[PDB]
Write a protein that binds this DNA or RNA. Structure first.
Ligand SMILES: Nc1ncnc2c1ncn2[C@H]1C[C@H](O)[C@@H](COP(=O)(O)OP(=O)(O)OP(=O)(O)O)O1
Ligand SMILES: [Mg+2]
Ligand SMILES: [Mg+2]
Lengths: 545, 412
RNA sequence: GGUCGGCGCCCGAACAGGGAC
DNA sequence: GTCCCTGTTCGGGCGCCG
């Protein structure tokens, strides 16, 4: 029936009252389904007929379970949610199959009518009031309150998950070496007993769950692989993602694109080399989820590539804690990175991508460091340890970067893997001035009001330039002055400036900018043999600053 | 039998609601073992999701320990309990500690589990053990006794601690003892032998008084001072003088009497950076007066007991790290430099973590406060790695900066 | 057509701090 | 007061799980 587990004292936010909302008018089919349901639960212990001394009401509806005929009765408890106390969620993330160890025997149970088997706080029941029309117009309709966790009420998930832990604990304690992956009401149960002992242990556990009001219907995957679980198929020595079906469109709405990008993202956990930059690039200046947007040629190419990636078949393996984790990263271009985590070669635990872009200006070294950071944290969640890295950057490159950078930066144990394109720094600033090279004192400034500015330089050899700029800023004119000295100098050059801003952008050796100007500067820096940059204060009459 | 000190957060503030971060397997194993034992002793107990509060939990090994030690990050709870532990039940900081020749740090956190925690306050001390691969929902506990890591616990235990140390103090009245968080700072001017001996005695005294202990020997006198220094050259290039003038121009915000007029003159044309230019007699004079000013202390610079401390750190390269501690801009209470710490020449994060602990430990001794750090590191980088290197039972506050060195101010 | 909790990815807007005119 | 760097912190959308 209903669990004997003690109830969870729940309250409302101080100075707030229960909900007062009238039913969504709904389809007759829905009404019939709900009528069946409410009668059932009435009979069972789950629902109770309320009198007229119940002032509150909140709308209900129903959905279908997937590949099913049964209805899930939901309650739009939004308003009530606004007015319920906050909870601390105990669900901290999602189990992943690449994190499972190899077990000799495996079972996957599911709990029948999970929520409705858990008693609600007596004193709180009053607010879960809902009405159901017998017919849409014909009769007033019977109305009720819940005695058990509703479905749509913001406290239900954590209360269920915590109650499930509470129930499982005596059994788990009695059975130290039975692994139980508990996610909401899915129980993946794994052991190293022979199939007989294991089946016995399973029966024990189902009995136990029964003693606490919890039923395991015979939608239990008996130890017959493959087991369907958390969106995956679990074979004895491999797992795969359940079939992913990409959107196909003649004409693409922003809704379609969001759906496609989401689906590719899910896919990228085990399909190597999936990119989304170009498809994602079309969702920048978008307003309507209905708004249609033309596929760029480049986006088109990206989609073709992903679509044929999703053709050649893949599977991940399980985790062997007696072998090292390895994480291997390749560079894709345009700030896109992918990676595979494996233990034996060619046998991925899982794969993944990193494409995020942070800051206006950046370089490949920084982005690789970020991809390492992301993978590290993911690995800690999944396996609780940091994998050894294989990275497409020369040990010397990395040493030059981290030892000269003014920010603290680090990468854990890694080795060079010679898989092009290699990550490199594209240019290097001198630490000392260059003898025999022309010195440029550069300078730019603009008008805050009129947005007109000037950028130019004067040279120890008499070279001079001034350039008028239209619709600009101080910062812009400052990058412009530097850029003109780069444009007009030989292969070696010293450049003096008072822009801390421009100097602070350039000394971080970026190879990538949101800003065209900065990118042009970068192109110029790459063509030089030797560039020395220096700062001097303004308003003190240093040269032509 | 023991009476619990009522505790109320500062008016107009909620309890902490901070998300638990991912833990390595060895840290989760240690924590699971520790909390199991602690619940068996009543020190903590399970709570549900209807307690809306949370504080991150993790685990560390102290320097040379091999013994995992539970650490709760009560920073949020501490700055919400502030007038409770700083004002109502503040612990006095002894000006003499910092003057002592030798100062030893002893761990006494365990003691605090002797004392019940105010029933109404327990809910605020909630934490959640996480699990590898999210095999389970997190397991939530709260504290029944005074927790390690909360500034309230030394506050409340203060009475018992003074009562306990009373004899030893009576015998050795020359010795300063300071209680900060889970630590006891024991300073004296004895020569080392008799110092360490006395520490051993105190360890025994504490041992019999029902309180255990898991070298840690400071010498505040040798806490170096890192000033601003100008270069010395027989020949000066245009570039050298530009460097010299930017440095002096930065310096002037701290020392008002500094001037660059004569030196600036030398840079009037637009000469080649590499060109040597004779120092003008006036310029030499200005320069010498400036070395003189930089030799002297800043004027009117005093610790304000009502303001917080701030620490900035600069990465100088080659394992070298400079820092300043101030309450107001350009009014440095202290400057310094570390070199050759664990991780030198291979790991910036480990070095910086060490720097942060050294500096915090120094501030505790000198002022009885822990500074808020400005850290030269991207946030993600720090957050990913700092708990792997943390060896202390407190955690300072911090924020992130990215300040390209245009002038080499604190290192030559 | 419509509810909840978690985790992923992306977009946005505010707010705090800090520099530079 | 604009312009332009660190960081919060809340909102939205899609995917996936229950
Ligand atoms: N779309 C949803 N909205 C709110 N709660 C949900 C939703 N889907 C699932 N849940 C919650 C309520 C369920 O009791 C619990 C378990 O999920 P589920 O196994 O899918 O249904 P169920 O246990 O209630 O019935 P069944 O026996 O068919 O599995 O998760
Ligand atoms: Mg179910
Ligand atoms: Mg289920």
């Amino acid at each position: 029936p209903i669990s004997p587990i003690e109830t969870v004292p729940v309250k409302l936010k101080p100075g707030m009252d229960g909900p007062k909302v009238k039913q969504w008018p709904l389809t007759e089919e829905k009404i019939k389904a709900l009528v069946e349901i409410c009668t059932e639960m009435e009979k069972e212990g789950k629902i109770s007929k309320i009198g007229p001394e119940n002032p509150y009401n909140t709308p209900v509806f129903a959905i279908k379970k997937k590949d099913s005929t049964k209805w899930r009765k939901l309650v739009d408890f939004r308003e009530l949610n606004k007015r319920t106390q906050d909870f601390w969620e105990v669900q901290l993330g999602i189990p992943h199959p690449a994190g499972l160890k190899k077990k000799k025997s495996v079972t996957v149970l599911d709990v029948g009518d999970a929520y409705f088997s858990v008693p609600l706080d007596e004193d709180f029941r009053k607010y879960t009031a809902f009405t159901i029309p017998s017919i849409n117009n014909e009769t007033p309709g019977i109305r009720y309150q819940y005695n058990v966790l509703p479905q749509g009420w913001k406290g239900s998930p954590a209360i269920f998950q915590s109650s499930m832990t509470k129930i499982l604990e005596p059994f788990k304690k009695q059975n130290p070496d039975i692994v139980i992956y508990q996610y909401m009401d899915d129980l993946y149960v794994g052991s190293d007993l022979e199939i007989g002992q294991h089946r016995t242990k399973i029966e024990e556990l189902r009995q136990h769950l029964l003693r606490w009001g919890l039923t395991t219907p015979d939608k239990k995957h008996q130890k017959e692989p493959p087991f369907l679980w958390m969106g995956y198929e679990l074979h004895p020595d491999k797992w795969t993602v359940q079939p992913i079906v990409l959107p196909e469109k003649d004409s693409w709405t922003v809704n379609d694109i969001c759906k496609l990008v989401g689906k590719l993202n899910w896919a990228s956990q085990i399909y190597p080399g999936i990119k989304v930059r170009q498809l994602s690039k079309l969702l920048r200046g978008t307003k309507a989820l209905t708004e249609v947007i033309p596929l760029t040629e480049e986006a088109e190419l990206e989609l073709a590539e992903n679509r044929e990636i999703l053709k050649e078949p893949v599977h991940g393996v399980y985790y062997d804690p007696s072998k090292d984790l390895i994480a291997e990263i390749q560079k894709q271009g345009q700030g896109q990175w992918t990676y595979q985590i494996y233990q034996e070669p060619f046998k991925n635990l899982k794969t993944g991508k990193y494409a995020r872009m942070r800051g206006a200006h950046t370089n490949d070294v920084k982005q690789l460091t970020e991809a390492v950071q992301k993978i590290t944290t993911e690995s800690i969640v999944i396996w609780g340890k940091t994998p050894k890295f294989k990275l497409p950057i020369q040990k010397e490159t990395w040493e030059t970067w981290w030892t000269e950078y003014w920010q603290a930066t680090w990468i854990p144990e890694w080795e060079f893997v010679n898989t092009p394109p290699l990550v490199k720094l594209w240019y290097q600033l001198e630490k000392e001035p260059i003898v025999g090279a022309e010195t440029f004192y550069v300078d730019g400034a603009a008008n805050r009001e009129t947005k007109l500015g000037k950028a130019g330089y004067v040279t120890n050899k008499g070279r001079q330039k001034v350039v008028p700029l239209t619709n600009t800023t101080n910062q812009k004119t400052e990058l412009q002055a530097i850029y003109l000295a780069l444009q007009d100098s030989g292969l070696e050059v010293n450049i003096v400036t008072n822009s801390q801003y421009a100097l602070g952008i350039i000394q971080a050796q970026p190879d990538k900018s949101e800003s065209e100007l900065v990118n042009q500067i970068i192109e110029q820096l790459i063509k030089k043999e030797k560039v020395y940059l220096a700062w001097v204060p303004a308003h003190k009459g240093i040269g032509g600053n | 039998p023991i009476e619990t000190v009522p505790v109320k957060l500062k008016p107009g503030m909620d309890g902490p609601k901070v998300k638990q971060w991912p833990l390595t397997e060895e840290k989760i194993k240690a924590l699971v073992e520790i909390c199991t034992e602690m619940e068996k002793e009543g020190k903590i107990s399970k709570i549900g999701p209807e307690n809306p509060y949370n504080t991150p939990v993790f685990a560390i090994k102290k320097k040379d320990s091999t013994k995992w030690r539970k650490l709760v990050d009560f920073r949020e709870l501490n700055k919400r309990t502030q007038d409770f532990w700083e004002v109502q039940l503040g612990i006095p900081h002894p000006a003499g500690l910092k003057k002592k020749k030798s100062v030893t740090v002893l761990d006494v956190g365990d003691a605090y589990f002797s004392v019940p925690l105010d029933e109404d306050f327990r809910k605020y001390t909630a934490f959640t053990i996480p699990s590898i691969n999210n095999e389970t929902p997190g397991i939530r506990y709260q504290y029944n006794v005074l927790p390690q890591g909360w500034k309230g616990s030394p506050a409340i235990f203060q009475s018992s601690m003074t009562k306990i140390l009373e004899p030893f103090k009576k015998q050795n009245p020359d010795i300063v003892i300071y209680q900060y968080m889970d630590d006891l700072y024991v300073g004296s001017d004895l020569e080392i032998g008799q110092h360490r001996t006395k520490i051993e005695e105190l360890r025994q005294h504490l041992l019999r008084w029902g309180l255990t202990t898991p070298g840690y020997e400071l010498h505040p006198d040798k806490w170096t001072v890192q000033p601003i220094v100008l270069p010395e050259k027989d020949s000066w290039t245009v570039n050298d003088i530009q460097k010299l003038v930017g440095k002096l121009n930065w310096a002037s915000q701290i020392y008002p009497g500094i001037k660059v007029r004569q030196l600036s003159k030398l840079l009037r044309g637009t000469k080649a950076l590499t060109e040597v230019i004779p120092l003008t007699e006036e310029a030499e004079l200005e320069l010498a007066e400036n070395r003189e000013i930089l030799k002297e202390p800043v004027h009117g610079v005093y610790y304000d007991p009502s303001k917080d401390l701030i620490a900035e750190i600069q990465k100088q390269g080659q394992g070298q790290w400079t820092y300043q501690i101030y309450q107001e801009p350009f009014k440095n209470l202290k400057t310094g430099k570390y070199a050759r710490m664990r991780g030198a020449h291979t790991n910036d994060v480990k070095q910086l973590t060490e720097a942060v602990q050294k500096i915090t430990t120094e501030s505790i001794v000198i002022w009885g406060k822990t500074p808020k750090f400005k850290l030269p590191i991207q946030k993600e980088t720090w957050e990913t790695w700092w708990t792997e290197y943390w060896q202390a039972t407190w955690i300072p506050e911090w924020e992130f900066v990215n300040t390209p060195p245009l002038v080499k101010l604190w290192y030559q």
